[PDB]
Design a protein around this ligand. Structure first.
Ligand SMILES: Cc1cn([C@H]2C[C@H](O)[C@@H](COP(=O)(O)NP(=O)(O)OP(=O)(O)O)O2)c(=O)[nH]c1=O
Ligand SMILES: [Mn+2]
Ligand SMILES: [Mn+2]
Ligand code: NA
Ligand code: NA
Length: 326
DNA sequence: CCGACGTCGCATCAGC
DNA sequence: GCTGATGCGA
DNA sequence: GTCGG
């Protein structure tokens, strides 16, 4: 938290450009700058010092100078005073509501948490559940709770088929002391890049986790990805645990390492790694790493037998999951 | 200066 | 219904 | 908004 005030300012600017301006690249420009300043191990004394970092240009340098001299940013101060901005920003915090839906609700006058509650018939399913657990969905999850949830998921998955391998990724695998949610990568021998010898592979798992009342709600559900809600059991007389977000991703067994790399994160780490792969002439997704031909068309999947091999191709020294928290 | 900015899964909709 | 775009999300 | 070419 050496430069917490600065990275907060940039994060807020990033949120504004995303939710209000709907300018996704500005949003990522601020996010990158916030990220690169975050891992910077010096208390930044001036915007020019910060400009030396890759991802910090003139406009941000000027804003960091204003922030360091006053403790505030006049651009952010106005944005806060704007009703439309403050309204749209708030609505996007509800899962299922993006910038588009948030702005549309404001046109109708639906702009508060109470407006949403009286207008439930105007929300889709995802948004309704997002409103339902709006309170719970902003609480963090302590690692102690993540360990409990992990115990249940891995065992419930073992109870359906002993060949299911489940791996908790995301910030948990990065060794975070707390997580925003739980992320589960899933592999079964029947599902490979060649064939899907058994249908409902993800469905059976989800079905099981619902049966024991772990999974309580579903935001979206397909053949390879589940997006929903989970909750820890509470002993007698204790206040219930908050409902938590859970993502489950079924990825082909032979493509485990590309999947586990992607799911481990962080989102910005994946961004910078895949952006570096392009400069190196490769393309990385959750499945394979493919070379780029003379044209720029993805070639055939190069062989991968560890997470490190992916780093080897793009000429990166291996970085442990805890060193990827960007 | 200026094109390019990771990559993909699911829900929802317009168009046929 | 299918296909492709869009919205929102991982 | 930033940056490599
Ligand atoms: C949202 C997002 C997800 N991911 C794939 C990798 C992110 O690290 C990851 C897990 O998603 P998450 O739980 O939404 N993000 P996190 O696990 O790094 O942070 P947290 O635990 O929710 O706070 O999933 C991306 O590659 N880019 C993204 O923008
Ligand atoms: Mn997570
Ligand atoms: Mn997640
Ligand atoms: Na810079
Ligand atoms: Na949202």
């Amino acid at each position: 938290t050496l430069n917490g005030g600065i990275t907060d300012m940039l994060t807020e600017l990033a949120n504004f450009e995303k939710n209000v301006s709907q300018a996704i690249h500005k949003y990522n420009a601020y996010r990158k700058a916030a990220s690169v300043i975050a891992k910077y191990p010096h208390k930044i004394k001036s915007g020019a010092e910060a400009k030396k970092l890759p991802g910090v240009g003139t406009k941000i340098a000027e804003k960091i100078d204003e922030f360091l001299a006053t403790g505030k940013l006049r651009k952010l101060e106005k944005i806060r005073q704007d009703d439309t901005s403050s309204s749209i920003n708030f609505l996007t915090r509800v899962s299922g509501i993006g910038p588009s839906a948030a702005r549309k609700f404001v046109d109708e006058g639906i702009k508060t948490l109470e407006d949403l509650r009286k207008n439930e018939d105007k929300l889709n399913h995802h948004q309704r559940i997002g409103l339902k657990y709006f309170g719970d969905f902003e609480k963090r999850i302590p690692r102690e709770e993540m360990l409990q949830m992990q115990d249940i998921v891995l065992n419930e998955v073992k109870k359906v088929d002993s060949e299911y391998i489940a791996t908790v990724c995301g910030s948990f695998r990065r060794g975070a002391e707390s997580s925003g949610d739980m992320d589960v990568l899933l592999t079964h021998p029947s599902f490979t890049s060649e064939s899907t010898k058994q249908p409902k592979l993800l469905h059976q798992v989800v079905e099981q986790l619902q049966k024991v009342h772990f999974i309580t709600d579903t935001l979206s559900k397909g053949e390879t990805k589940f997006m929903g809600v989970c909750q820890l059991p509470s002993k007698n007389d204790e206040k219930e645990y908050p409902h938590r977000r859970i993502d489950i991703r079924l990825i082909p067994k032979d493509q485990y390492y590309c999947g586990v790399l992607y799911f481990t994160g962080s989102d910005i780490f994946n961004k910078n790694m895949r952006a570096h792969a392009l400069e190196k002439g490769f393309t990385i997704n959750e499945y394979t790493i493919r070379p780029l031909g003379v044209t720029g068309v993805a070639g055939e999947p190069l062989p991968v037998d560890s997470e490190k091999d992916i780093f080897d191709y793009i000429q990166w020294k291996y970085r442990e999951p805890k060193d990827r928290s960007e």
